[PDB]
């Protein structure tokens, strides 16, 4: 036979002693929600294919939750996982971490705005930023936090004046022209 | 022709000092009973699929058991594995191990109460605790074994006197709201 | 699409710096003898599937042994592997290692008689014990080897005196009852 | 039970603290562009298999880009990846890196000219070296940067004086005839 | 719905600092020549399955070789790999490297004679040693290069005087019996 390419199931544990093959919880929750919502197979199998992706403390929770209610849906199992493992960030601490992110790692301007944007996305899920200015606070924090050249600095400020508040892909296209 | 998303076998070994990817026995027995009862495959291949999850002392038991009776069923193999490796606990010993279990130096309180809830389920399956007092022995064992940061100590002492005591998911909802 | 469990080939090497993913030779020899004896495929292709389980020094032995004789059987290759890598136990080191093996460090008595039984199979295949008394030397070595009290000793001695010499499974059943 | 030969998905992550399994981005982009262009599967499942090769910061860029515009093509995702992680060399910096690259302590002459040729290809793709003299700057940089042992310096000076100019494989044939 | 066995593709890299999974080149070339000769698919598929076995410097050679001539066959690619990485040794150098090879400072005598026998096969393929004296040079080179002592020295010199000299497997049996 011709060779097989394959992807591992992403495994989650909740353990503080996390292995290199174990993901952070949000990555696993995307896989688990795909199994719950998008796979064609019955919920009596979807319970099992979620459990196969768990080991250690997080697998114990799958047992605890089914012991409390054998009739539970997979979606409601994931609500229990969200309840337990969903992050402890406050509005204050998400805002501080978003504002005190500052190109320290020698990043390109494009790489810095990628890292920053992960925290901005988080802050917008917490509603810690108004969605109607999420683009403005991106420009603000990039212009505060990045070692800009003037030719890009004035181009961002022109877009800020004109009203085309960049989406992340628009801000990237604008950064592409000056960074290349 | 395309990548197949495929899943890790749950390895077991029976050694005290097990490797980081090797499961506790109860989790392995759940996999092995699925191979025994549920898979469509012929029984000569069921033995193969059981044995290819074993390593070290547990694989040696499979060899011993097969050598004394080549005609043995996979069900009677798993009865031998239960009879060797299965948990030995009783009413008094399970209550003691539960009540003796305190918060370890590296544990966050939310992780400790999750670990502790597994021990409570163990004790309830041994009929060592009546389910109708499980909430009491949660709050009390948490308060006896963990440090509670003074502010959560007051909140759990309030809840202990409140009347309607927390279920585990609600207790975690509270404990996460103090982990922030 | 739907995931299923993959089973990794058990690679062997004979290297002194053995990797965690490399089995001890006896485990590999079971896999290789299965490929030799049980697989339906032609012997030229059996040589290939045996070779794909080897790397480093043990793969070089496959090349050396084929270079001496291209017509060689897989069985004769495995005789060369047994010669080179199989353990050098004598009828006096097997007996001493067996008889010197006590229960240790607070092992479960069941886990001890399992550990002990692996050495008794080693000694019986060396014919370093008469097969017709293997159960006798097992009972005696357990009674000498396991630190004990209570009726367990009395029950084993009763079975020894009565004449119903236990199989390993019957011995294990009795040991669990007094271990719990 | 017959084994299939398998090939692992080359994972990428974009962290500067990269793990030993993770490729440089240029190799990952060759896999990702195969998925985008060649595989017969619909774009939703193409996006899934591209994303399933990612871990950490690179996966965060995929999530950001899909959230910022769900209508985006796979090719447009890869354009975002090219911008963020693709190396921004210049005619100045590439010429410097090429000419600066001398033979390390451990490199044999063939291993050195192989490493060196990768940097020459890099520089030629930026038009930093005219293709019609690429071979000239190869032989010259070999002589400038190699610690050619005694008679190798004499032989390479005769080869710089050859007349017609070697392609890389012809230069390798010559170097390998000397190498002992 | 079927669980499956997996064999790892033998990755090669050509770095002198080779990682623990990575083969010596001659073993990789045996895999790549299987892909070139024996697999039924077109040359475009063959090129891909060869490239997906390569990592680091050796993958860069595959890019260089294809970029010079996209019309190249996989057979001609493997000739370029043989030329760059495949060993070139003369009769003088193969004789010297066999004779200069002593027991390594932490090595066992049994591992040494197996390591040494690989170098004898190498030297016989260069026609650097006549096959009809290979046994003589095995005993002499073991005795010259190993930290021998005790009745092993006596038994080996006895075997040198015996008339018909050991085969490799018989010499290993003797050295293993003294290893105990």
CSV table of C-alpha atoms in Angstrom, one decimal, chain C:
chain,number,residue,atom,x,y,z
C,1,UNK,CA,-14.9,10.2,8.1
C,2,UNK,CA,-14.6,8.9,11.8
C,3,UNK,CA,-11.4,8.3,13.9
C,4,UNK,CA,-10.2,4.9,15.1
C,5,UNK,CA,-7.2,3.7,17.3
C,6,UNK,CA,-3.8,3.2,15.7
C,7,UNK,CA,-1.4,0.6,17.0
C,8,UNK,CA,2.3,1.5,16.6
C,9,UNK,CA,4.8,-1.2,15.4
C,10,UNK,CA,7.0,-2.3,18.4
C,11,UNK,CA,10.5,-1.2,17.2
C,12,UNK,CA,13.6,-3.0,18.6
C,13,UNK,CA,17.3,-1.9,18.4
C,14,UNK,CA,19.6,-3.8,20.8
C,15,UNK,CA,21.3,-0.4,21.5
C,16,UNK,CA,22.8,0.2,25.0
C,17,UNK,CA,21.2,3.7,25.0
C,18,UNK,CA,17.7,2.1,24.6
C,19,UNK,CA,14.9,4.7,23.8
C,20,UNK,CA,11.7,4.7,25.9
C,21,UNK,CA,9.7,3.7,22.7
C,22,UNK,CA,12.0,0.6,22.3
C,23,UNK,CA,10.9,-2.7,23.9
C,24,UNK,CA,13.0,-5.3,25.7
C,25,UNK,CA,14.0,-8.1,23.2
C,26,UNK,CA,11.5,-10.7,24.5
C,27,UNK,CA,8.5,-8.5,23.6
C,28,UNK,CA,9.9,-7.8,20.1
C,29,UNK,CA,10.6,-11.5,19.7
C,30,UNK,CA,6.8,-12.2,20.2
C,31,UNK,CA,6.0,-9.7,17.5
C,32,UNK,CA,8.7,-11.1,15.2
C,33,UNK,CA,7.6,-14.8,15.8
C,34,UNK,CA,4.0,-13.7,15.0
C,35,UNK,CA,5.2,-12.2,11.7
C,36,UNK,CA,7.2,-15.4,11.0
C,37,UNK,CA,4.6,-18.1,12.0
C,38,UNK,CA,1.1,-16.6,11.8
C,39,UNK,CA,1.0,-14.0,9.0
C,40,UNK,CA,-0.2,-15.3,5.6
C,41,UNK,CA,2.2,-13.3,3.4
C,42,UNK,CA,5.2,-14.8,1.5
C,43,UNK,CA,8.6,-15.3,3.3
C,44,UNK,CA,10.4,-12.6,1.2
C,45,UNK,CA,7.9,-10.1,2.4
C,46,UNK,CA,8.0,-11.5,6.0
C,47,UNK,CA,11.7,-10.6,6.0
C,48,UNK,CA,10.7,-7.0,5.1
C,49,UNK,CA,8.1,-6.7,7.8
C,50,UNK,CA,10.6,-8.1,10.4
C,51,UNK,CA,13.2,-5.6,9.1
C,52,UNK,CA,10.8,-2.6,9.4
C,53,UNK,CA,10.6,-3.4,13.2
C,54,UNK,CA,14.4,-3.0,13.6
C,55,UNK,CA,16.9,0.0,13.8
C,56,UNK,CA,20.5,0.4,14.7
C,57,UNK,CA,22.6,-2.7,15.9
C,58,UNK,CA,19.7,-5.1,15.6
C,59,UNK,CA,19.0,-4.0,11.9
C,60,UNK,CA,22.7,-4.5,11.2
C,61,UNK,CA,22.3,-8.1,12.4
C,62,UNK,CA,19.5,-8.6,9.9
C,63,UNK,CA,21.8,-7.4,7.1
C,64,UNK,CA,24.7,-9.6,8.3
C,65,UNK,CA,22.6,-12.7,8.6
C,66,UNK,CA,21.0,-12.3,5.2
C,67,UNK,CA,24.6,-11.7,3.7
C,68,UNK,CA,25.8,-15.1,5.0
C,69,UNK,CA,22.8,-16.8,3.2
C,70,UNK,CA,20.1,-15.1,1.0
C,71,UNK,CA,18.1,-18.4,1.1
C,72,UNK,CA,17.8,-18.3,5.0
C,73,UNK,CA,14.4,-18.6,6.7
C,74,UNK,CA,12.8,-16.0,9.0
C,75,UNK,CA,12.9,-18.7,11.7
C,76,UNK,CA,16.7,-19.1,11.3
C,77,UNK,CA,17.1,-15.3,11.5
C,78,UNK,CA,15.2,-15.3,14.8
C,79,UNK,CA,17.6,-18.1,16.0
C,80,UNK,CA,20.5,-15.6,15.3
C,81,UNK,CA,18.6,-12.8,17.1
C,82,UNK,CA,18.0,-15.2,20.1
C,83,UNK,CA,21.7,-16.1,20.1
C,84,UNK,CA,23.0,-12.5,20.0
C,85,UNK,CA,20.4,-10.7,22.2
C,86,UNK,CA,18.5,-13.4,24.2
C,87,UNK,CA,19.4,-13.5,27.9
C,88,UNK,CA,22.4,-15.6,29.1
C,89,UNK,CA,20.6,-17.3,32.1
C,90,UNK,CA,22.2,-20.5,33.5
C,91,UNK,CA,20.3,-23.3,35.4
C,92,UNK,CA,22.0,-21.9,38.6
C,93,UNK,CA,21.4,-18.2,38.1
C,94,UNK,CA,17.8,-18.8,37.1
C,95,UNK,CA,17.2,-20.9,40.3
C,96,UNK,CA,19.1,-18.4,42.5
C,97,UNK,CA,17.2,-15.3,41.1
C,98,UNK,CA,13.9,-17.2,41.6
C,99,UNK,CA,14.6,-18.4,45.1
C,100,UNK,CA,16.2,-15.0,46.2
C,101,UNK,CA,13.0,-13.1,45.1
C,102,UNK,CA,11.1,-11.9,48.2
C,103,UNK,CA,8.1,-9.4,48.5
C,104,UNK,CA,9.7,-6.0,48.8
C,105,UNK,CA,9.2,-2.3,49.7
C,106,UNK,CA,5.5,-2.8,50.6
C,107,UNK,CA,4.3,-4.3,47.2
C,108,UNK,CA,0.8,-5.7,47.0
C,109,UNK,CA,1.2,-9.5,47.7
C,110,UNK,CA,-0.7,-10.1,44.4
C,111,UNK,CA,1.8,-7.9,42.6
C,112,UNK,CA,4.6,-9.9,44.2
C,113,UNK,CA,3.3,-13.3,43.2
C,114,UNK,CA,2.8,-11.9,39.6
C,115,UNK,CA,6.5,-10.7,39.6
C,116,UNK,CA,7.5,-14.1,41.0
C,117,UNK,CA,5.5,-16.1,38.4
C,118,UNK,CA,7.4,-14.4,35.5
C,119,UNK,CA,10.7,-15.9,36.9
C,120,UNK,CA,9.1,-19.3,37.5
C,121,UNK,CA,8.1,-19.4,33.7
C,122,UNK,CA,11.7,-18.4,32.9
C,123,UNK,CA,13.1,-21.2,35.1
C,124,UNK,CA,10.5,-23.8,33.8
C,125,UNK,CA,11.4,-23.1,30.1
C,126,UNK,CA,15.1,-23.5,31.1
C,127,UNK,CA,14.0,-26.8,32.8
C,128,UNK,CA,15.8,-25.4,35.9
C,129,UNK,CA,12.6,-26.5,37.8
C,130,UNK,CA,10.8,-29.9,37.3
C,131,UNK,CA,7.5,-28.9,35.6
C,132,UNK,CA,5.5,-31.4,37.6
C,133,UNK,CA,6.3,-29.5,40.8
C,134,UNK,CA,6.2,-25.9,39.5
C,135,UNK,CA,3.1,-25.3,41.7
C,136,UNK,CA,4.8,-26.7,44.7
C,137,UNK,CA,7.9,-24.4,44.4
C,138,UNK,CA,5.5,-21.5,43.8
C,139,UNK,CA,3.5,-22.2,47.0
C,140,UNK,CA,6.8,-22.7,48.9
C,141,UNK,CA,8.4,-19.6,47.4
C,142,UNK,CA,5.3,-17.5,48.2
C,143,UNK,CA,5.1,-18.9,51.8
C,144,UNK,CA,8.9,-18.1,52.2
C,145,UNK,CA,8.8,-14.9,50.2
C,146,UNK,CA,5.7,-13.0,51.2
C,147,UNK,CA,5.7,-11.1,54.6
C,148,UNK,CA,2.4,-12.3,56.1
C,149,UNK,CA,-0.1,-13.0,58.9
C,150,UNK,CA,-3.7,-14.2,59.2
C,151,UNK,CA,-5.4,-17.4,57.7
C,152,UNK,CA,-3.7,-17.0,54.2
C,153,UNK,CA,-0.7,-19.1,55.2
C,154,UNK,CA,-3.0,-21.6,56.9
C,155,UNK,CA,-5.2,-21.9,53.7
C,156,UNK,CA,-2.2,-22.3,51.4
C,157,UNK,CA,-0.7,-24.9,53.8
C,158,UNK,CA,-4.2,-26.7,54.0
C,159,UNK,CA,-4.3,-26.9,50.1
C,160,UNK,CA,-0.6,-28.1,50.0
C,161,UNK,CA,-1.4,-30.7,52.7
C,162,UNK,CA,-4.8,-31.8,51.2
C,163,UNK,CA,-3.3,-32.3,47.8
C,164,UNK,CA,-5.1,-29.8,45.6
C,165,UNK,CA,-2.0,-27.8,44.5
C,166,UNK,CA,-3.2,-24.3,43.2
C,167,UNK,CA,-2.8,-23.0,39.6
C,168,UNK,CA,-1.5,-19.4,39.5
C,169,UNK,CA,-5.1,-18.1,39.1
C,170,UNK,CA,-6.4,-20.0,42.1
C,171,UNK,CA,-3.5,-18.8,44.2
C,172,UNK,CA,-4.2,-15.2,43.1
C,173,UNK,CA,-7.9,-15.5,44.0
C,174,UNK,CA,-6.9,-16.7,47.6
C,175,UNK,CA,-4.3,-13.9,47.8
C,176,UNK,CA,-6.8,-11.2,46.8
C,177,UNK,CA,-9.3,-12.3,49.5
C,178,UNK,CA,-6.8,-11.9,52.3
C,179,UNK,CA,-5.1,-8.8,50.7
C,180,UNK,CA,-8.4,-6.7,50.6
